Amino acid sequence: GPHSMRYFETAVSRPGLGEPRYISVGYVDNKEFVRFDSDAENPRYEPQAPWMEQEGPEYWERITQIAKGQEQWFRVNLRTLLGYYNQSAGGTHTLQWMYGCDVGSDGRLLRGYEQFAYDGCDYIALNEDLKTWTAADMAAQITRRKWEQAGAAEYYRAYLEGECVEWLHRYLKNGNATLLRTDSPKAHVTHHPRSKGEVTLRCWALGFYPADITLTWQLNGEELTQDMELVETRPAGDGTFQKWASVVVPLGKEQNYTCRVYHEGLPEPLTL
């Protein structure tokens, strides 16, 4: 159904060394398709996804310019900020930026955002209406004002509504056969020799995609949602991820406890 194309470009300060390492990256539904990297022998926006080879040099050039340009912006900028934060030129920094548009299966845009951050803690962000500015601290509100003068909200909002959605609609078409693959998870349970004369049922799900997955331990319809310490959905390797669940259960009575795995790619939810 609906989708999202977002870009997460960062800048790391290397004052003494010689130049910040502005690195950009691009995603279409949690899937990375382009990355730049201002430290490479040849700065080039190389295709990650396979479906991005079919574009051409016409499009691979038009990009690397936008790249080096923002490089300047992340440079020029980053510096003004040690002035704002009255920090002596030496402490490494990180100016970050993220943007994109979320489109409903229907076709029209649903929401778009832009956000900057300087060393983690938020610095400023456009609001939902695409017109307001949520500046973080005093040194950041300085910017909120200045941007309302040139009309940051009408410039960026412009890119959001049309173009971001426009190109998005292009990407999906080009990589349709790949992007919409929904790999279903594989069932697996486990019990361990824990010293308390207890057992540990481990509900193992592997090779799945997308990652948004629901997973719990049961006991008669009602779900043992409290004792099941589970993991943080982590990247297996090839492309399909994995997740696991835990419930400490003494012998004999074990057979009663169960696991359940919910995921967008199953015809009937799984009960193990």
Partner: peptide, 9 residues
């Protein structure tokens, strides 16, 4: 399609 940024932060 990365967009350009004029307005210096």
């Amino acid at each position: 399609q990365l967009s350009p940024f004029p307005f210096d932060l």
